[PDB]
Symmetry: none
Subunit: 125 residues, 16 copies
């Protein structure tokens, strides 16, 4: 019912990363963002500044499989989905990479803000 | 308010290390989701999966906690799990694991709705 | 709605294998059963007789994750689920094994019969 | 009735080998599920996943088919996919894959609702 | 139609090997039997005697629960008293460690009906050698 | 008698070595079954599988080769049926320029249809001995 | 409260190394600087001169887009003009092949406030050596 | 001056070598941070982490060891603050019975509280040199 | 004719498998030449060379074995001379307890002297197939 | 006495192979020739055709100065028109690199005198295959 | 005092890094002894040994290098004698273009003769740190 | 002339280590002793205490017959009360297996005559570490 | 005359296999030279070297002898030594060695003046 | 005394091989020559014909060390010497090769003939 | 002529080492003895003291092959011989070891004294 | 007297490094014996063996000499040969060799009668 909005906002964020448009990513993310990801080497990154590097510095298509949104109150949600990223390597052969993601959401003045983001498996930068 | 979230997380961790499921079951939401290395990159649907490990010398340390409080009855702690143990050879070993636990306060006590584990 | 019956009948079959009760397995399966599984070495096995071997010849717990039942007509269904089998090895350490399963179902005189069964990943015999 | 299921399966396979998506899209059910080696042990939710491979010398052979017909408008074919191709070195190679396709006849033509692929 | 008899006679022969009863094997096989098999090291063995070794030297201590499955048969019937079955041999057994194992072998058996019963004149075997 | 079966087998083999499919297609039964190392332990149905190896054969990779048929054993059944079980010693020259030999154990089941002998089944152990 | 100044001064120093501006590094560091780092091979280097090498010998051809992140800081304030920050150095860069790489290094910097600005008296570094 | 800091460091080291935690606990600040090889590139918070190594030390594994503190460099700040940066040459005897030496680069930040010196932070590169 | 040569060859082979030299000595010509893998590419003169393998055979190492003579080709010359060229498929059981097959290509030149057939020369390629 | 003729005829055959003149080889060999040789992969090749390959596919670019030596001959004469020579083949040649190499091979040739000239009915070869 | 010994040691080191022998020859005693890794565990007598490394240094192999003298310990004896025991951290850039550090433990015995300090003995453990 | 006293005092020290008598070693060595040796892992150890470990932890069960030889000495005499000997240490011993072994080590010892007896202020050692 | 040289060579060989030096000493010339693998490519000066091996199940076979007779009291035999023995594992092994023995008939019996051994 | 003639005739033969003059080698050798050498692969070669190959198909210098001539009768000798052959490899570096030789000699109508020749170690062809 | 005395005195010394009688070795050797040997690790040992170790701390037989004595003056000689030492290893198998030796001799008050001793190849301690 | 022996040894060494045989031939005794690594553990009989190396950037250093003087016209020097050279790669290398040279003064100049070389 309300979980359908959380999945749509998650796609927008993912599309911002695949397209490489930071201004869209920055809007959907909470300036005070925490994140565990394989690129962080088992550390909790504090800023946008960490992610900006990957934006500022190939045909791909992300698929969001088996979503599970835990809705809390009026303005809080926790989606736990799988990230099947399809891309083409330098050699020219097509490759798929699986990554398990958890994104904690907080609705602030209308739009949904991303406060925390967990990522297991392959890095998608 | 974040200090309460860290205390409830320790209780849950202690329940796993002590092997007391009834304590784990209380602190966890019966409708629990979880990504963990044991799940082989799948989202387990709750309790019954964990029960297996309970029914069938260590010291856990919770480093660099970061609690994101949302509303009155919602929190998201993102901490590191440094588990110290002793191998079969007899030498002491440490294992690092990155954990995210999403919390929901229901009729007083804090319930764990989702749990992520890397490493 | 009707998919909930297919998931329950699948659990009964799985439980029959874990418990090692063939008579229950034989009832839920169609005597004319086809099956691709890792034990078959990429061949389509024809009988119960193949499975009987594993029954006639350890604490485990199977979990059925991300089910997807395709209902066709009144008496036909196709469930596509993941088999997370938790067990304890000979050394005494606990192990988990993932296997992707597809079971095609056919309702005959009340009870659901299993006509075909696909299994990718780890064998659970 | 099983002879129709084998013919429709060939059309789909030929659509993939020829790289004509419009033919693949017609024969497949928009709400398509699929276990395949490319999915990394996950159940893909349909079309968009496959489109990638289409948009971005071989001969396929369909060995030992086994069609389970259910009702008037339902079938389950379980066949082997012997795909013959030529490697970069120039030598010819064969690759075996075990496939299960669940079919549903909708307004005349057969639609593919589920597709399993091992090997 | 007539191919169903060829598959039944093939099972009897296979069961004779799994059970280790040579007299049954000897009856179903043609005394002038040719055979390519992995045990022969790429040679065509003559009639019987070669196989007897595997039957006779089978000890009860090494006797393991096994079950053979005959998958995707293809019987080519020629005349009234001749047939050629080409099947796959999925042999399920339990190793010395106690774990269950499966072994695939591709078999071709040429049959000749003599005074009622079917006689095996030639036998080809690729893959794993699946005599106990 | 058996001498006709060995001659027809050579024609088929020569069709593969020369890379002339039309000759291969004539001598083979359109409904052909076959176990061979290229099939990965499966029973192929059709010419279509074999056509690939004929058509994709380049003249640049065309090497001087000579097949030898050793220790034949033809089992004649009725008037229009035969089963030859022979060894295929294929002599060729590798890309480096050195001469190499490859052994393969073959069983071909034959059926005489409207004059000429047709190949209904074909088994092959050892090395895959097709120019490709 | 006062720890926020220590984290800001640490960033300035780090930025001086990433930008390759020694004059800024020299100002923020105490001329009598001690340092354990992976480049020192388990020795305590004396004040400056050792570091100058890495600044001066940095060529523009090898100049790579890099971005340092300071994670989980822990500032121990002592008196009015002394601090000890213990932080993790996640350095993001792009290798010669063109692929992006991250390198972790555990750092401890002991600070001493002299005539206004903070001076770095000691510097410890575990893990990867992350000077260009 | 600096001579007091080196003496207090020896007491702490001796507490670890002797395996007496109560002495270690006294000399260390309950709010202790620490980078060490056992922490896997993380900053540990507490005694609790260290207690494990003291308590789980068996008398059967108790080996004759002798620590040497080489090239100390004490940075004194104010009246009640110091930063020693020394090398830890730990001499021990392995299970085989042969004598072995292990080098580790250490930085310990000290704070004098109600008389005795308290250890607030502790850095360790190289070998983990705790009896276990 | 050639059937007598194959029977006498079996007697000789059986004498080696049974380890009865007196039978071997009778069937062999005292002036026997032989190329075999045990000779290291030399032509041995005498029984004396072979006697070693018979006499030094222990009962503890005595294994169930069965030799098979495949694709014989006897070249008869005059009344009292023959040349058999056969393959020796020796089936045995290794120390581990598993069954093994070993191929060896043999040529034996025969000479009929005062009734019984005498072996004047013996060639052996492949595996040395004597119980030892 | 009569053995000297057998050694001379063997040299002629060997020289025919080294010179690459098949017509001379074909004359000295019996059209119904059997042969065990390393090139045959432990099989008994039929008469001619197999050998022709090595003669015909010999290129002038790969033509190397070679010299065969026949050491320790042992001719077993049977009747008037039958002989069995067992000799060693030391073939001296020069490799592609330009260095001289020697290769040993143990040979047995069974001879039959037909209308004057000696015909070779069987030929065994162990060790190195020494056809250009 | 000891500060003069460290300055004269730098001059000598700089003479080796710059490749100016005349400066090295002046600062060294013509009757110089030396243990170094290049000597293969022997005590070299003369400049002549060292001259080789100076003279055979090519400008093509000339790399940007910087030596650092860490933890000096000068033992002054009388008016005209000193013994410095220091560590040689030599920073350089390899042929691949990556920066490398090499540690070497050095002992230099000094003797003040007609004003300037002369080097009578020189010990070197670890890496040989001469541009060559 | 005066160098003969330096070689005798060096032997006394060496004999103190081989005999395992520390009190004799302690007398001949300067309490403020520096030393580079292979056991120190490229560090300069402080005075005594480091060495005591090797003396005290020497067990009688591991006590092996050893004999040190001082080859090619070179004593540099400075003033009245200073000397620098540079010698090779050929230590002969017997391993646990019982076989005799020799170990080479290049040593430099700087000497200072204090109230009669010669005191050792510095000691360098390359090659094998030759303390029991 | 060559048949006598082969018989005397067997006696010498048998003396070594049996380990009877007095027989070896008689058949050998006190001034004996010898190249053998034990000598490490040096020419041993006689008896005393061999005595060591005597003082501190096999069957030797002498294949392809070639005796060069010179004058009345001189011969040069060049033969192959196929020595059959049993290894520690219990399996039978053969070892080839190429030998040249130069003979000199002195007061009746044949004396061995030189002995070469390859392999 | 008489052994000095045997060493001189051995040098002539060796020089014939190093110079590659067969006619000189053929004269000094007995047409019925036996020989064990490393090139023969542990066989006794019968002819000149074997050696001719090496003649018909680089700066070297042979040295004859520790000769030991056993003189028998008037026309028989047995020299046992070491062959230190110095040569330069294809790379251009100088190499030495040791070979232990025994040559049995027979004086026929004046000149010494070589009836047998043994060679251990390295081949000098 | 005079070289025969040098070979006899060399045997006495060798026998003293094989028998393990130092007093005999000490007499035949010059107290001021130099020596290059494999045990010295490419150094020139100065004393008896080095050798004493091996004496103070198995059936063997030494053979002295191809001696070459260079006689200088009335009381000086230089023998250059090969040391073929035959022994039995711990396993029980017989082994031979070659070593090239040079011993410089000086006749002092009757008996020959050994002033220098070189040894290449295998050590015989 | 030992200082003359060391000077004559340098002249000989320099003759080898410079490749001037006439100088080497003068300083060496025509009846020269020599153990060296090139001889493969054999005693070479003089000149002709060495000539090969002469007819078909380095710096030699003579360390720790020890001259044993015997009579008026005899000496035995035992020294170490540290030869410095540059490999094909271009890096500098050192090679150690232990040498013993026995000297005999004949009509003025010192002649080399024997020469040992290890390493």
């Amino acid at each position: 019912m309300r979980k359908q909005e959380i999945i749509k906002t998650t796609e927008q964020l993912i599309e911002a990363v695949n397209n490489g448009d930071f201004e869209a990513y920055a809007k959907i993310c909470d300036p005070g963002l925490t994140s565990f990801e394989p690129e962080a080497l088992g550390n909790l990154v504090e800023g946008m500044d960490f992610h900006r590097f990957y934006f500022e510095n190939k045909p791909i298509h992300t698929t969001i499989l088996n979503p599970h949104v835990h809705v809390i109150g009026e303005d809080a949600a926790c989606i736990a989905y799988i990230r099947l990223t399809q891309y083409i390597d330098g050699q020219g052969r097509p490759r798929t990479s699986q990554s398990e993601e958890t994104r904690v959401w907080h609705r602030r003045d209308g739009k949904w803000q991303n406060v925390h983001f967990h990522c297991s498996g392959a890095p998608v930068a």
